[PDB]
Amino acid sequence: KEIRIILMGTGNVGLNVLRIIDASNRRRFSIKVVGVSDSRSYASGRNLDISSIISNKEKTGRISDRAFSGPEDLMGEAADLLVDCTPASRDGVREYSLYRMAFESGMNVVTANKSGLANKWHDIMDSANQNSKYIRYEATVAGGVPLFSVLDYSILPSKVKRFRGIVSSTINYVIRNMANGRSLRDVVDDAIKKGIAESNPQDDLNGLDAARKSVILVNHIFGTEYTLNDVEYSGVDERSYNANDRLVTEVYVDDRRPVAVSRIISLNKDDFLMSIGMDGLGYQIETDSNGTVNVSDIYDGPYETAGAVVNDILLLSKV
């Protein structure tokens, strides 16, 4: 009948998460938001008025006029699930702490934030295990393109041999647009307007966003507990880019060891990844029992990413 959530972060993605929940509730499970924050304020309570919170955030830039000190402020209400739409920390410790607090409080977790899982996979899964809880992370790789839900429920009979995809938006948008002769400033301005740039855009340009995604992918698919120290990645540099250059993230096994690598590649015309449009993301998974499957979208933005977060909420409602 109803799932109670706490939402941390109400920016590009988190405010859209509220919008989707509100639209969903109006069709009528029910998703009841019992706690919500931004960096400075919060709301907490049994019957929180989501459209009113959306309106107040849009108009004033704040969730409320009630100062937020940390996650502890939100643990006064019984909830089933914590949703993390906060920006990446440098080391993942803040996120680990949040998820651990959630798990110990009887909650599962849904996250769009990549830093906790990219840095602290081991400690996060240990706390999940010890508390008998779950974490889902659809939005952490290729925002709005179905990926982990596909791997979890569409190719159950298979071993995955390889993953290759365009999964980090801003770096790819930058490379493609600079190949057309645009300045970095202009492209970055467009990425911000679209809502796809990281809260720290240097994370995009140095390839760190892709790197984080590659950790989550390799650990998910091959069962490893790698960190950023174990993957290879590259950022944008001063080269003149070609029209067919893309920042491709690959996960596969080399000499019995899983590898995660993000690199700039000049793609062949017939590569599936070249079918992906300027505003989209996508990937290809090679499997041993379900063939080679290709998945992409047309426009991958914070709204679509929010839809991935809400899909995760609904998948966890059935546990």
Ligand X SMILES: NC(=O)C1=CN([C@@H]2O[C@H](COP(=O)(O)OP(=O)(O)OC[C@H]3O[C@@H](n4cnc5c(N)ncnc54)[C@H](OP(=O)(O)O)[C@@H]3O)[C@@H](O)[C@H]2O)C=CC1
Please give the positions annotated as active site.
Answer: 213
Q: Which of 72, 131, 77, 122 is nearest to 100 (CA)?
A: 131
154 binding a second copy? (CB under 8 A): yes
Q: Is 264 helix (H, G, I), strand (E, B) or coil?
A: strand
Question: Is 52 flagged in the annotation as binding?
Answer: no
Burial of 292 (0-12, 13-18, 19+ CB in 10 A): exposed
Alpha-carbon span 316 to 277, nearest angstrom: 31
Question: Is 95 flagged in the annotation as binding?
Answer: no
Q: Which does 310 bind (CB under 5 to 8 A by kind): a second copy, Na ion, ligand X, none?
A: a second copy
Give 39 or 183: the residue with its C-beta nearer to ligand X.
39
Alpha-carbon span 236 to 165, nearest angstrom: 17
Question: Is 14 flagged in the annotation as binding?
Answer: yes
- Residues in contact with ligand X by the rule CB under 6 A: 8-14, 37-40, 85-88, 112-114, 139, 143, 195-196, 198-199, 301-302, 305
Give just the sign of the alpha carbon dihedral 225, 231, 236, 242: negative
217 binding Na ion? (CB under 5 A): no
CB count in 10 Å sphere of residue 93: 14
283 DSSP β-pair partners: 165, 295
147 binding Na ion? (CB under 5 A): yes
Query: Among 59-67, 70-78, 141-149, 216-224, which window interacts with Na ion (CB under 5 A)?
Result: 141-149
Q: Which does 150 bind (CB under 5 to 8 A by kind): ligand X, a second copy, Na ion, none?
A: a second copy
192 binding a second copy? (CB under 8 A): no
CA 238 and chain centroid, separation: 28
Q: 169, 183 in Cβ contact below 8 A? A: no
Q: 82, 99 in Cβ contact below 8 A? A: yes
- By CB under 8 A, name the one of 53, 85, 124, 308 that touches a second copy: 308
Query: Among 17-25, 32-40, 43-51, 70-78, which window interacts with a second copy (CB under 8 A)?
Result: 17-25
Ramachandran area for residue 256 (φ above 0: left; ψ -120 to 50: alpha; else beta): left
Question: Is 86 flagged in the annotation as binding?
Answer: yes
142 binding Na ion? (CB under 5 A): yes
Q: Which does 297 bind (CB under 5 to 8 A by kind): ligand X, a second copy, Na ion, none?
A: a second copy
Question: Is 318 flagged in the annotation as binding?
Answer: no
Give 179 or 315: the residue with its C-beta nearer to a second copy.
315
Of residues 159-188, those binding a second copy (CB under 8 A):
159
Contacts of residue 248, Cβ cutoff 8 Å, sequence gap at least 6: 164, 165, 166, 262, 263, 264, 265, 267, 273
Mark out the alpha helices in 61-106 (DSSP H runs).
Answer: 93-104
Q: Is 212 helix (H, G, I), strand (E, B) or coil?
A: helix
Query: Among 103-111, 233-241, 254-262, 283-291, which window interacts with a second copy (CB under 8 A)?
Result: 283-291
227 binding a second copy? (CB under 8 A): no
Of residues 287-306, those binding a second copy (CB under 8 A):
287, 289-301, 303-304, 306
Around 77, how many Cα atoms within 13 Å sit in the side-chain half-sphere?
23
Alpha-carbon span 107 to 226, nearest angstrom: 25
Binding region for NADPH: 10, 12-13, 39, 57, 86, 114, 195, 198-199
Residues at the site binding a second copy, with contacts judged by CB under 8 A? 20, 23-24, 27, 144-146, 149-150, 152-159, 272, 275, 282, 287, 289-301, 303-304, 306-308, 310-311, 314-315
Residues at the site binding Na ion, with contacts judged by CB under 5 A? 138, 142, 147
